[PDB]
Paper text:
The crystals of the NDM-4/l-captopril complex utilized for this analysis were also grown from poly(ethylene glycol) 3350 and belonged to the P21 space group. This time, however, there were two monomers in the asymmetric unit. The model of the NDM-4/l-captopril complex was refined to an overall R-factor of 20% at 1.3 Å resolution. The reverse turn in the apoenzyme structure that adopts two distinct conformations (Ala 55 to Val 58) is a distorted Type I turn in the NDM-4/l-captopril model. In both subunits of the NDM-4/l-captopril model, the region delineated by Leu 65 to Ala 72 adopts two distinct conformations, labeled A and B as shown in Figure 3A. In conformation B, Cζ of Phe 70 lies within 3.6 Å of a carboxylate oxygen of the l-captopril ligand. The sulfur of the ligand lies within 2.2. Å and 2.1 Å of Zn1 and Zn2, respectively. The bridging solvent in the apoenzyme model, as well as three additional waters are extruded from the vicinity of the binuclear metal center upon l-captopril binding. As a consequence, the coordination geometry surrounding Zn2 changes from octahedral to distorted tetrahedral shown in Figure 3C. In addition to its interaction with the binuclear metal center, the ligand also lies within hydrogen bonding distance to an ordered water molecule and the backbone amide nitrogen of Asn 220. The determined Ki for l-captopril was 164 μM and 210 μM with a corresponding LE of 0.37 and 0.36 against NDM-1 and NDM-4, respectively.
The bacterial metallo-β-lactamases (MBLs) catalyze the inactivation of β-lactam antibiotics. Class B members, known as the metallo-β-lactamases (MBLs), are structurally distinct from the Class A, C, and D enzymes, require one or two zinc ions for catalytic activity, and are not inhibited by currently approved therapeutics. One variant of significance is NDM-4, first identified in 2012 (17). Although it differs from NDM-1 by a single amino acid substitution, namely M154L, it demonstrates increased enzymatic activity against the carbapenems and several cephalosporins.
Residue numbers in the entry: 41 to 270
């Protein structure tokens, strides 16, 4: 279709200023598993959502940005303390990029075998990021929907687009399962999925970690599967 290959990664333009990055990691019982994040150009800078699985892959994301956009990466926000989302933090840091995560992600990252972000986000009781903790986030709208896939999972909308990113909270409309639930909050998951949908009620393109972009039926379907856990 429109997928651009760059080394071992894939880049898909979703909107004029927005690309999805995709990287892969072998896992037993699963094969080579895709993880998606985002790249957003905001004026004269670039914003990244999530690393790739590894430092090397993350450096390749930066190389793609250099080749295709050739503007500084002002910051990255990473959406929970798992390897697919934070595996590449040292590559961002080597590159001089300021990093942000949920406070709880930074607290958990060491024991997860991950490097913490440099800056912690905290969230109002209504789930919206406290805006003073997310300086220079431009069009990124960061929302904590409650515990679900993990206790620390956060989501991101993009102002001026029809896109909302569910990270590993949301699976596609035909997904057979919710994946590994080892760190999940099975009581709260369905509500958290629905809270994501309600935070971004206008988004028609739902982007997520482990499926291609889908309609909002991804949210309804994920929530319906999560209903079965409680
Ligand atoms: C390591 C990642 C973190 S979200 C994971 O748990 N995955 C990646 C694909 C599905 C699921 C699994 O192993 O069940
Ligand atoms: Zn995860
Ligand atoms: Zn994941």
């Amino acid at each position: 279709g429109g997928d651009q290959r760059f080394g071992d990664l894939v880049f898909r333009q979703l909107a004029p200023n927005v690309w999805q990055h995709t990287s892969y990691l072998d896992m037993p019982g699963f094969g080579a598993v895709a993880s998606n994040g985002l790249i957003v150009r905001d004026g004269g800078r670039v914003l990244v959502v999530d690393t790739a699985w590894t430092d090397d892959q993350t450096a390749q994301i930066l190389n793609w940005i250099k080749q295709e956009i050739n503007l500084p990466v002002a910051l990255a926000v990473v959406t929970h303390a798992h390897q697919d989302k934070m595996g590449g933090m040292d590559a961002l840091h080597a590159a001089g990029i300021a990093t942000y995560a949920n406070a709880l992600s930074n607290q958990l990252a060491p024991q997860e075998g991950l490097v913490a972000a440099q800056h912690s986000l905290t969230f109002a009781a209504n789930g919206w990021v406290e805006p003073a903790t997310a300086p220079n986030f431009g069009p990124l709208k960061v929302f904590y929907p409650g515990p679900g896939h993990t206790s620390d999972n956060i989501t991101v909308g993009i102002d001026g687009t029809d896109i909302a990113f569910g990270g590993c909270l949301i699976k596609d409309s035909k997904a057979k399962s919710l994946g590994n639930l080892g760190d999940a909050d099975t009581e709260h998951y369905a509500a958290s999925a629905r809270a994501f949908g309600a935070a971004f009620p206008k988004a028609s393109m739902i982007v997520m970690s482990h499926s291609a972009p889908d309609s909002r039926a991804a949210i309804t379907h994920t929530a319906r599967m999560a209903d079965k856990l409680r």
